[PDB]
Symmetry: D2
Subunit: 249 residues, 4 copies
């Protein structure tokens, strides 16, 4: 199927039109969705007002096995992160529905961590390839794992930075050097060029490849009500450039 | 007059609908647009597909005295940007009285990428803890035209806005250094204050369509042109309006120091 | 009494000669040593090869009330450091009333490396431009005992010294964060102020010989033990003297917040 | 000859006793000096009060060809640098005599740039190996050259960071990334452990391997008089890990 896919930004994000999301889509719509997702890192479906907790949950299961910690968020995820990277097999994907949408503010921003890696000069990609980092849940908006800083993506084979606010430190370097190296690689992920911002409407859905993005939820809506609900899908164990695996410690 | 005003982001930015920009809008509509501008820092008008080089110029004049910098043919003041401003700045802060405002029109608009992001330098200011507001009040910076996408001047880091009375951070990528401080100290003080300006909360991103027009209060924003569109054509045209001499928290004024 | 005092570095540090440290020095010699200490921030006595665990302890008591922290046998208060403090700090700033002073003796001294460097936190303060003195006055930091080489407390960043009246930076590697600021802002404000403390100009390095003794005013220094000697034995023994509760620029006092 | 060599710090610097410096030392004393210099990166000779402008200059020539820009310094070199790295063939060595020595202050500090490199974790040495930097004389205390950040030392073969305040930027990286990477590699050079500080007496001489050190002159002596005089020796063209050479641009 060629679905109706309109890219949102130069280097990540696509709206998909003419698809009402259900627990009843057929393998072709589902696979096309899954390739749009790998290609564009985050995908959006508007006017999905027919959807409700249970359709979301049953629509989710069509794309892998759901995992706990359906989550409700209402306090606010404004730091750049990849969902649950303090566990070994952190989600492969998240599906997020807008239940209550603020009139101004309330946006969400995604960063493509594959392209982030691609744009690093070669010597700085070689070094990213050899680094590992400690993820902890000292930080949660809603455990200590070691992940390689470069995740070879189990399906595209695309390499992506595996970083974000869950990172406690880079293994094997002083405080000062871990901050400097994390600032470099991290500031490549959040470079504006590598991101896409979604202004939400009630009933909008977004689905992202957590193996290959970070995201941040803008806290600018003061006390306007904002409720979003999230389903995540279990993910594989991260494999680094040299084949080594993540290990929870 | 209450224009039909839809805020884009929590802290900056408003679309204005039902207004057809021309050299012939009445004083009232202009005043209301001036109020939206000061309040929202950047305002957007979609579907101005009737505008052209000359009407953009004539429309500009209704909001102040346009000024140049090499301009588009047929025009007195129009600067074309194409073949990129991907760097947080405030326009021409390397001169003493930098534009108070720029009016930008989309001529050619990439199918994907091509966006622009504005930051609310007055909100950046309000959010800093008192002691660091106090320090920002007391600093000065040298701006230069080394780093231009399209001269040295000394500006306070905090500009008292000549109409709102709101204080704003005055920084961006025209800054060579903070006057009075080592290089390491300059970079760390700059990095703190700048990082409030660009904090996502303080920004608004616009996706352009041919005929979109944006107007921003350059006294109280920085902006950034996102360079993600490859070789897709992107043509925008800009008119700037002459601005006043910035006045610091304690009345001091900027001074050009190389020309 | 004018002791025989030779300054080591331009801005901190003095060797004192012709004095044999004992539990039996007269009030005069002690007062003169107290004056050298406050003036020079760290003072050095070579060739105290007669000192031992007990005489070090007895000598300490002549300068204030010694305090502990697991101590050396035979002693009430003596801490042994060996098998390393290579990190700029001020002693035990994770407690509310941290030592005002430590007295350190070299027991075993590497043939090469093994040095120690002190920084004059009061000079670090004097050298900052007025506006950044003003900001440093207004800040507070949390110190913790996460990072120890040998509890959370809140200290002003500027301590008014209880005898000299000199203000000093109160920072070092016991600081977890600046209270009231993001992580990025804390690290940048910390990095600015710290970088004045350790600026080479403000420091003095000592090469140890067995029997060297150093005494520093812990209210107005940081120090650092240089880790360059490999597996060469290094044994030093330290006695700390109880200190007052730090008082900030505007009279506020530190408060322990976890124990 | 085993000369009388007493190391000053754990990882750089040695005083040499029982040697009066002259234009008349014999090849054995001179070679032993040259090996002490390569081994310990900086070497010091006390009580050389017999020395004067011309003996210095004639003692110098016994260790390579002198090069201009005998220099007099009196304003002050307090930034970490390697002498003349804005030229292609910057000095291999400097010889510095203390003419007037302040009573307190006035010290000098050297950093061993070889050991600095040695202590970097492997992946961060691999990346240093591939970097180049632009040296300029926008900064002089007393031209734009590209040097590799890692100089393979023409005699020891020891690799050393080639950095310092003459560096305008790292070639091939944004402003922000060049500052972050330079801070990392640079803060390894100036780590206290890698340095040695000399308190000068009138007539003290110091000679350093500029291929393998940086140094900084402490400005803490206010208006006390301080005069030192320096002779430098021409050096080879820097060769990087991969054999490429520096090029003045
Ligand atoms: Fe999340
Ligand atoms: Fe601009
Ligand atoms: Fe200590
Ligand atoms: Fe030099």
């Amino acid at each position: 199927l060629e679905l109706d896919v309109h890219p949102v930004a130069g280097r990540i994000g696509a709206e998909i039109r003419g698809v009402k999301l259900s627990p009843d889509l057929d393998a072709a719509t589902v696979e096309a969705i899954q390739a749009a997702l790998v290609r564009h890192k985050v995908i959006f479906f508007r006017g999905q007002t027919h959807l409700d907790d249970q359709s979301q949950e049953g629509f989710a299961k069509l794309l892998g096995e759901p995992v706990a910690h359906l989550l409700q968020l209402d306090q606010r995820a404004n730091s750049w992160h990849t969902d649950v990277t303090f566990v070994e097999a952190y989600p492969k994907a998240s599906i997020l529905r807008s239940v209550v949408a603020p009139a101004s503010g309330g946006d969400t921003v995604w960063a493509n961590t594959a392209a982030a890696y691609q744009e690093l000069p070669e010597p700085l990609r070689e070094l990213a390839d050899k680094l590992w980092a400690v993820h902890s849940n000292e930080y949660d908006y809603a455990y200590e794992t070691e992940h390689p800083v470069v995740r070879v993506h189990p399906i595209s084979g695309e390499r992506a930075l595996q970083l974000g606010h869950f990172v406690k430190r880079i293994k094997g370097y002083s405080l000062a050097d871990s901050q400097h190296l994390f600032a470099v690689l991290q500031g490549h992920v959040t470079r504006l060029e590598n991101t896409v911002r979604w202004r939400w409407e009630a009933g909008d859905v977004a689905i992202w490849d957590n193996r290959a993005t970070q995201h941040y939820a803008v806290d600018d809506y003061g006390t306007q009500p904002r409720i979003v609900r999230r389903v995540t899908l279990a993910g594989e164990v991260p494999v680094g450039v040299d084949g080594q695996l993540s290990r929870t410690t």
